Structure 1
Amino acid sequence: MEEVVIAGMSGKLPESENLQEFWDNLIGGVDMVTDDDRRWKAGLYGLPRRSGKLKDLSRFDASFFGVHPKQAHTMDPQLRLLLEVTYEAIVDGGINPDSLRGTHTGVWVGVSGSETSEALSRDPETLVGYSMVGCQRAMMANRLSFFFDFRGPSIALDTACSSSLMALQNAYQAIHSGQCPAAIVGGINVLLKPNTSVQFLRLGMLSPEGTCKAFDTAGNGYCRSEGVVAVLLTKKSLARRVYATILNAGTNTDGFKEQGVTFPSGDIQEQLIRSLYQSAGVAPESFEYIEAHGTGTKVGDPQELNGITRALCATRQEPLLIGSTKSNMGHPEPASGLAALAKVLLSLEHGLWAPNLHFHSPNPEIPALLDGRLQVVDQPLPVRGGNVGINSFGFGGSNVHIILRPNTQPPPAPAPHATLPRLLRASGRTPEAVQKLLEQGLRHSQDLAFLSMLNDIAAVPATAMPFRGYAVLGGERGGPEVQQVPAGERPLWFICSGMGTQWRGMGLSLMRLDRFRDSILRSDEAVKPFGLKVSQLLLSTDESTFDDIVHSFVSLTAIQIGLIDLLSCMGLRPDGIVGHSLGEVACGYADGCLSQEEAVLAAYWRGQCIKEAHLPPGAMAAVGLSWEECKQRCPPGVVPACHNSKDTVTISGPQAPVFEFVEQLRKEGVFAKEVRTGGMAFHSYFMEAIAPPLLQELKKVIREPKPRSARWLSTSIPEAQWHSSLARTSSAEYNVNNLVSPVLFQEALWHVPEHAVVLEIAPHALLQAVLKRGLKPSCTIIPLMKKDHRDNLEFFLAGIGRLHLSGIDANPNALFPPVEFPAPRGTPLISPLIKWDHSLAWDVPAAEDFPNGS
């Protein structure tokens, strides 16, 4: 009752390390079968010289899959290759494999031989026990279920040549019945000992020329080949990527035949095909292509093709295209179904049917090839539309047939959010893997679904993949950044600065993000009744607006609240919060003890009470003196205000004490930074009378307060008063004490741990130099906005990107509108982009480890 789709694909086929190399060789018309001594001699025992073999067989990333190096040498090579391509298939689906770690997904593998098992057990005096664990035929599925933590059925089955498609049929029935949510289908074949080829030669099944002349007059046998293929099957609701939908799948057996056990029977195959499409409810006119078994034998090809033309070409009125990938590749026996399925799905993805090789004249015993009812694809011709049938028949008599419907999702309509720059994060075992992923993301910068699945597969722990990277796409600067991430957990800390950081155009560039704009409009409707709206303070800003201190207060708190909201939808939960005056006001929303409206009205009421009453113009000169030397060198009535660092302390007072330290700024090395904000002496004794009018207004907004958390480190309260009744809750008296007390921004900074990642929440990171000398040198400081930046959205996205390079997982897909659930076809492949650590070589059995009759 559930729809079953094909979600992922990966493979290793002759002269085809990756699935793309496979496709290229297939459409290139290259003879992937070769005459090389890569496994045994050229023509020993009278064997054919030509065979299809894999490029390499001794490469395995043993540390990733957690196998001991002594156990990896005594493993079946086909199991090592199956582990790697099984990871690559899940990643090709767009699914992180960690989301299937407890589920009931099953594994079905089609194998037919275990030659490594009998090569590794020839000497009973030097045996090891690990050869049983790494080479037994059930372990080809059980090791996959063990590593990927799969709780479903784990079966290895052998059904001769139809073994791989039979596994697909059983996995189909498991998903269809609701037993399993997902499944993995595999198929493996490796040619190691020549005695099996001598057996097939004496049976009469091997061509002397080593060629599958499919549907040809000169066909006299097949050519043996290798291959390791895996696909990922899932229900429709879990699929990020869809290649095709399996309409139906079934099987039968020939039964008794007078001719023999080996001989094919086309009547039972015709019955299987007709019963399948009937039960599926599809008309035979709707087909356009059928991938035949097509092994090239003398008696098998007319039986199969006459069965096809009886079941399908009765009342059709159109030619039916037919092909066979064994003419391009050779015939891997238990892995022939998934290799043909890979060719079909690659042909559907690229829009062109891959041609057949070695087809010159039709077989005269097949009359449908002579009048045009069946047409062999011998040239590349485009895909028009309809269903594709795939059948594979074993020589024992097992018949399997699949009907699948390709997906035809068009590329989406253009949208105004598609012009915004995006983030792309990557991970890998080596720097080259991260470079490959980032450069392929740069090549396809306008493909939104491709970037979404690439961002989805990047959340791997640093112990598994120790190299991470990022690149900002769609911007003007660009540039991949790759570095090695240290292992372990690093705490994330939030620091939000105070006043003096406003400018012309605060956060406009990232007003294009929807969630930031929603937060800004929420703060707008909150201050709307109070004769104010921060939207004109954002868009219609000139120099007559931010010299006011009320507008500066609300335009600081709203921007910090919007940044915290963006970080909260990002998935990030802070471990420690420490602010600075109005930053400490926004720390209430950062901690959750405040909400939007109370924070914005508290900031506006602070500004309103300050602008209501009037006190002598104040100063904020900054001097190059410590905290203790400033108390003894100020005149009476002049108080130190800000304890930023051990060398930077801000003084507060009137103009004549400000003019007093102009002369002492000439003396020695003393800073003469006299930056003021409206000429008002915040954090001073001049506002001891400001609090009682202000406190009255506040009690009407932050009534029934909530207690502060242990993560919030207070900066207006000294350390010995942290347990008092005033500093447990974020009440109205807590906020008015912030204005009348000096900010202690040094003793809060020494409680930050050793390897913390510090995020600065400010419209301009002017506290970055203070935090560098004020914190431990094993900390990372990341700014989020920069004053007078042309595209501040690119600056924000680079901060999120280097947050990925520190070790904190943060998915930038949540910032943008989500992509529709089926990806459109023609989306680029992901499984060729995965690279492993292949610096080591492992043991492979040779031809001398098998009995030669000596």
Structure 2
Amino acid sequence: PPKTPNVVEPYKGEVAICGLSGRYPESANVGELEYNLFNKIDMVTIDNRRWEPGYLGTPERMGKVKTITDFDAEFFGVHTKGAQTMDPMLRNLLEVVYEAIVDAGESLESMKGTRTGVYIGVSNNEVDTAYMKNWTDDDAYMVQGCHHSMYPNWISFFFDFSGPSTAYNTACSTSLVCLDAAERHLRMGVIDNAIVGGSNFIYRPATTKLFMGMNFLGSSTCKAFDESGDGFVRGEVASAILLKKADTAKRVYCTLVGSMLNNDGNQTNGILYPNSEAQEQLMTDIYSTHKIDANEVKYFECHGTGTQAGDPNETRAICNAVCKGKKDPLLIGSIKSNLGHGETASGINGISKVIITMHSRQIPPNLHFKNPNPKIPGLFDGRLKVVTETTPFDGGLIAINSFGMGGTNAHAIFRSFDKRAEPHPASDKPRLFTYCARTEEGLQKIFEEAHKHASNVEFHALCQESANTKPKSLPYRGATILNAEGEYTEIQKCPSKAREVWFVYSGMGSQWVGMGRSLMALDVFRQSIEETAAILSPFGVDLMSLLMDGTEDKLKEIMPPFICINAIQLALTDLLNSMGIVPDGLVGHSLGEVGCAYADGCLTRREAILSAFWRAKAVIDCEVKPGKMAAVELTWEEAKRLCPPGVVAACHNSQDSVTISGGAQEMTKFMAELSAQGVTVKEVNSNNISYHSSFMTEPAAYLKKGLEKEIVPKPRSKKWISTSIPEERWGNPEAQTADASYQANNLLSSVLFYEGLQKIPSNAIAIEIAPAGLLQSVIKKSLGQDCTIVALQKRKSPNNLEVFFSALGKCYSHGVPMNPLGLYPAVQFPVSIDTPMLSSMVSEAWDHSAKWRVPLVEEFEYESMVDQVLRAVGKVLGIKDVSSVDGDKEFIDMGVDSLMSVEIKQALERDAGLVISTKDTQLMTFNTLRSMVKG
């Protein structure tokens, strides 16, 4: 019950900006914004997206995002009623925050429960005048979807953050005040991360008239640093960034040297007048507190509103504070000439441009700077130089200003991160890129981008850091092979419920020439084979020779097959363990029970390899009379009844396949008799040995004496399903350890494989670990129809590495977590600054089928009971089609909130006899409610 206090201690390390995302005018994501900036593309257009070009006399040109009617409500657990009565700014900001989190190499599970603070800056409540003009019942949810205090809070609620979540409103410099607050809270010890951001969308056509009446707005696009500048043009943004401590960041765009804020005071030129002295003092203070040499600034992201009273004062302050001592012109610029003035999102726009500049390492061109302003002497003395074309920013410090209306100025400094990429051993060999998304098209675009960056391993690591999200959040799971000879790509929708992973190990018969030869490309496989060959060398076996240059005649013998099959199984187990696949169950077929022991932790590499060696040695050295085996189609009981003395049933493969083994003459007589009637009999290459029969009495004992001094007894976990001891005898002491006794019993007694395959669930993902998919048909027939089956190798395949990668991609697509990068040396974090951005992929990989309400200009001017209860409950939540939604998703995952729980309880009482408490309602699924109503 007692709660451990948190260690709130001041932080003295570096603060790194890790992820960036946002919607910008004529740019659906950061990549489009970068492309438009670097191609001198003006993002301020004229159309009727918001209102007619001239409605109420407002300026025709504006900066508008592509769309604000799109949102993935189901992903964020917000119901239709709540989503409809929610600000489009909040929806776009939630999407952008998720995209930024993914961009920084973080995920939903990694950021859940962390001490992260949210510092959204928003100031536009026009969606409370349009939605209230015709207020009707069911619009109360606006309280939780439209209040400006709900912007960060929702981010805290969805991502499960537990840090200060506050909303700021500092006019046109709020985004940098949020950054300052995040720096203040990070350097004291309250939080380790920050979600500083900001959104601003234009809805009311009368606010532009308000801004025009004060002479704020100009005629044309913002003419930053231009003599003809007469105002700014409004813009829209939905941007967000993620800040983390530099020591724990997996990607570092840059470092936050420091940010500071100040005010102008009682100036005689009016409240809406910039104070050059205040800005100059703020700059001097920020550059002196951190001891930053102001002459080191390479680029200066100015607050270029384009007015005749703002640009001269800002330039004068910059010249007095940062150009004192500079021996070369200081490159100034702004993003307001490209996409206009974002109002409460100007600071976030400047931050985005600074990050783009320090990521692409090139300064975006500045538009509309034709004639220098005569009132800006710095442009004629050589102190200032507007960057009118792409300039190669190599490295250093970049300063950003944000002068909000009213005199509340803000400054910040960012230090570029110089960790240029170095080649990885990978990026030239095939790799398995696994990911997840909300839509098939989104995942296809993600795979296309991954192929575009097939030569980058840091990008693959950043993608993988968030590629293991649960199917509930990202139901579309997919996998593709980069740097592959043959194209491969799989995408499947995986239900919320997680299926169980079962490792199925094959026995004898998987031998062939070249087994595992291709898989030598992987370092881990070769290392495992070498560490097994070193073990087996002192016993007169050169595993490497038999595996690489071995021939069919060599594999005809008894030893090399056993040795090679065990080596392949152990190496594949090592590959899977390195890749991070934990098996929920383990089953094997005699000779694959040593591999099962190894994978279960009950045995070791030495123990397993030597157990197989001892088995083969005991079989060969003893003069066992020649025998034969074969898989007949007779049923288990039929085989047991029909087998005469001398021939018995070795293994119970499946429902209609049983292995008969016995002496050569009696076996041949059985073959003739069975072929006489209608029965399918298939002979198996057992090297003329009848395993699991009375003939194995003498070998088994020998094996025991062979392995008593080598196999240490260890416990057997319940995951590993025995296939040598009957189910009813699992509780006996002999079925507790995989000692020499267990090996002898397995080598002697029958193989009950059908029972072990029965114990498997009805939808388990069973992976056949073996040199070849020997028991594919047997396993598929035994399991059923709902069980996914994959083989890690294919016989005589031209390339087995691709087969292995495709098999594991199929396994991932069906919902098994794994780490494909575990087969290669780990990437050192933070990654190089050359790693592409992952935000664009997520931005274009959303589920946006539904269109939600947006403010309009016209609003600113003035039968089975079970199915019955199912439909009633679904309607209460707000789902038109109850059957459409998943049956394993809890109610809380949709957005059920207090009032809906009581309504559900009352509806159930009025409809059926159930009486359910409120708490249990939010954690019960549709399938569960159907089960209880049936009960």
The TM-score normalised by the length of structure 2 is 0.87
Of 287, 290, 300, 1:277 maps to 287
Q: 1:301 aligns with which of 299, 306, 311?
A: 311
Matched, 1:94 2:94: no
Q: Identify which of 449, 458, 483 aligns with 1:440.
A: 449
Structure 1: distance between partners of 2:515 and 2:298: 59
- For residues 461 and 754 of structure 1, the distance between their equivalents in structure 2, rounded to whole angstroms, comes to 21
Equivalent positions of 1:386-535 (< 5 A) are 386-413=396-423, 415=425, 417-535=426-544
**Taking structure 1 as reference, are residues 728 and 434 closer, same or farther at Cα in structure 2, changes over 3 Å only?**
same
* Whole-angstrom CA distance in 2 between matches of 1:748 and 1:128: 57
The secondary structure found in structure 1 opposite 2:196 is: strand
1:540 is displaced (CA, Å) by: 3.7
Q: What is aligned with 1:717?
A: 725
What is the CA distance between 1:537 and its match in structure 2? 2.9
Letter in 1 for 2:744: V
Q: Within 5 Å, which residues of 2 pair with 1:213-228?
A: 213-228=223-238
Give the match for residue 125 of structure 2.
114
Contact 1:2 1:178 in 2 (8 A): no
Q: Is 1:737 equivalent to 2:752 in the alignment?
A: no
Does the Cα contact within 8 Å between 1:3 and 1:176 map onto a contact in 2?
no
- Residue 30 of structure 1, CA deviation: 2.7
1:761 and 2:769 are equivalent in the alignment: yes
Q: Which residue of 2 aligns with 1:251?
A: 261
- Tell me which amino acid in the other structure corresponds to 1:610: V
Cα distance in 2 for partners of 1:303, 1:221 equals 15
Indicate the RMSD between aligned Cα atoms, in angstroms. 2.1
C-alpha offsets along residues 538-570 of structure 1, whole Å, 9 cap, x if unaligned?
334234533332232232222212222222233
Q: Which residue of 2 aligns with 1:22?
A: 33
Task: Report the Cα distance in structure 2 between the residues aligned to 1:409 and 1:558, rounded to whole angstroms.
Answer: 41
User: How far apart are the structure 1 equivalents of 2:54 and 2:240?
Assistant: 32
Aligned-residue offset at 1:629 = 3.4
In the alignment, what sits opposite 1:680? Answer: 689
Structure 1 Cα separation of the partners of residues 861 and 658 of structure 2? 86
Match of 2:338, SS? helix
- Is the contact between residue 113 and residue 162 of structure 2 (CA under 8 Å) also seen in structure 1? yes
How far did 1:847 drift? Answer: 2.4
Is the counterpart of residue 580 in structure 1 residue 589 in structure 2?
yes
Segment of structure 1 superposing worse, 309-318 or 143-152:
309-318
Q: Any idea what SS the aligned residue of 2:119 has?
A: strand
CA contact (8 A) 1:2 1:175 kept: no
Q: Structure 1 pair 719/259, CA: closer, same or farther in 2 (3 Å)?
A: closer
Residue 704 of structure 2 aligns with which residue? 695
Deviation at 1:722, TM superposition (A): 2.7
1:315 partner letter: G
Match of 1:232 among 221, 242, 246: 242
Identity %: 45
Q: 1:838 Cα shift? A: 1.3
- Contact 2:424 2:457 (8 Å CA) reproduced: no
CA apart distance, 1:45: 4.3
Tell me, yes or no, if structure 1 residue 564 matches structure 2 residue 573: yes
Letter paired with 2:829 = F
1:832 equivalenced with 2:840 (yes/no): yes
Seen in structure 2, the aligned counterparts of structure 1 residues 625 and 123 have a Cα distance that, compared at 3 Å, is closer
1:162-173 equivalences under 5 Å are 162-173=173-184
**Structure 2: which amino acid aligns with 1:848?**
E
Structure 1 residues 34-81: Cα deviation after superposition (integer angstroms, max 9, x where no partner)? 333333343344432222222212111111111121222221111111
Is 2:362 the partner of 1:334?
A: no
Secondary structure of 2:477's aligned partner: strand
The residue identity in structure 2 corresponding to 1:489 is: A
- Structure 2 unaligned residues grouped into runs of 5+: 1-11, 863-935
Structure 1 partner of 2:801: 793
Measure, in 2, the Cα distance between the counterparts of 1:175 and 1:623: 71
Give yes or no for contact 1:469–1:805 (8 Å, CA) kept in 2. yes
Q: 1:177 to 1:537 in 2, by over 3 A?
A: farther
Query: Following superposition of structure 1 onto structure 2, how do residues 189-200 of structure 1 map, counting pairs within 5 Å?
Result: 189-200=200-211
CA distance in 1, matches of 2:399, 2:423: 32
> Any conservation in 2 of the 1:760–1:783 contact (CA below 8 Å)?
yes
Assess if the C-alpha contact under 8 Å between 1:245 and 1:405 holds in 2. yes
Query: Which residue of structure 2 aligns with residue 360 of structure 1?
Result: 370
Q: Which amino acid aligns with 2:852?
A: W
Structure 1 distance, partners of 2:144, 2:649, is: 73
1:593 aligns with 2:567: no
Q: Contact 1:194/1:847 (CA < 8 Å) preserved in 2?
A: yes
SS of the residue corresponding to residue 628 of structure 2 reads coil
1:386 counterpart letter in structure 2: G
Are positions 1:324 and 2:324 aligned together? Answer: no
Q: CA deviation at 1:432?
A: 0.8
TM-fit CA distance, 1:508: 2.7
Where does structure 1 lack aligned partners over 5 or more consecutive residues?
none
| Residue in structure 1 matched with residue 714 of structure 2 by the alignment | 706
Q: Any conservation in 1 of the 2:475–2:494 contact (CA below 8 Å)? A: yes
Tell me which amino acid in the other structure corresponds to 1:8: G
Q: Which deviates more from structure 2 when the two are superposed, residues 288-297 or residues 582-591?
A: 582-591
Aligned mates of 1:44, 1:485 — CA distance in 2 = 49
Aligned to 2:559, the other structure's residue is in SS state helix
Choose which of 254, 264, 270 in structure 2 pairs with 1:260. 270
Q: 1-side partners of 2:483 and 2:52: how far apart?
A: 54
Q: Residues 563-621 of structure 1: CA distance to partner in whole angstroms, max 9, x if unpaired?
A: 22222233332222221111112222222222222222222122222222212221123
Mapped to 1, the partners of 2:142 and 2:630 lie a distance apart of 77
- 1:778 is matched with 786
Residues 295 and 324 of structure 2 are in contact (CA less than 8 Å); yes or no, is this contact kept in structure 1?
A: no
Letter in 2 for 1:145: S
Q: CA deviation at 1:87?
A: 0.8
Task: Give distance in 2, aligned partners of 1:362 and 1:711.
Answer: 76
Aligned to 2:867: none
Rounded to whole Å, the distance in 2 between the matches of 1:585 and 1:531 is 21
Secondary structure at the aligned position of 1:305 is classed as: helix
Contact 1:559–1:763 (8 Å) recurs in 2? yes
The Cα of 1:318 is off from its aligned counterpart by: 0.8
Aligned-pair distance for 1:465?
Answer: 2.2
**How far apart are residue 356 of structure 1 and its match?**
1.5
Match of 1:620 in 2: 629
The amino acid that maps onto 1:457 is: S
SS in 1 for 2:412: strand
Q: Could you tell which deviates more after superposition, 14-23 or 821-830?
A: 821-830
The offset of 1:635, in angstroms, is 4.4
Instruction: Tell me the equivalent position of 2:185.
Output: 174
- How far did residue 638 of structure 1 move? 2.1
- Partners of 2:572 and 2:203 in 1: how far apart? 61
The 3 A distance-change label for structure 1 pair 126 and 664 is closer
8 Å Cα contact 2:488/2:806 also seen in 1: no
Tell me, in whole angstroms, the C-alpha distance in 1 between the residues paired with 2:72 and 2:679: 60
How many Å separate the matches in 1 of 2:62 and 2:638? 87
Displacement of 1:133 in angstroms is 1.8
Q: Which residue of 2 aligns with 1:103?
A: 114
Moved more, 688-697 or 337-346: 688-697
What letter corresponds to residue 94 of structure 1 in structure 2? G
Which residue number in structure 1 is paired with residue 890 of structure 2? none
Q: Post-superposition shift, 1:825?
A: 2.6
Matching residue of 1:69: 80
Q: Counterpart of 1:660 in 2: which secondary structure? A: helix
Q: Work out whether residues 2 and 177 of structure 1, in 8 Å CA contact, stay in contact via their aligned partners in 2.
A: no
Residue in structure 1 matching 2:89, options 62, 69, 78: 78
| 1:127 Cα deviation from its structure 2 partner | 7.6
- Structure 2: distance between partners of 1:577 and 1:819: 31
In the alignment, residue 382 of structure 1 is paired with which amino acid? P
CA distance in 2, matches of 1:501, 1:34: 66
Q: 1:775 to 1:311 in 2, by over 3 A?
A: same
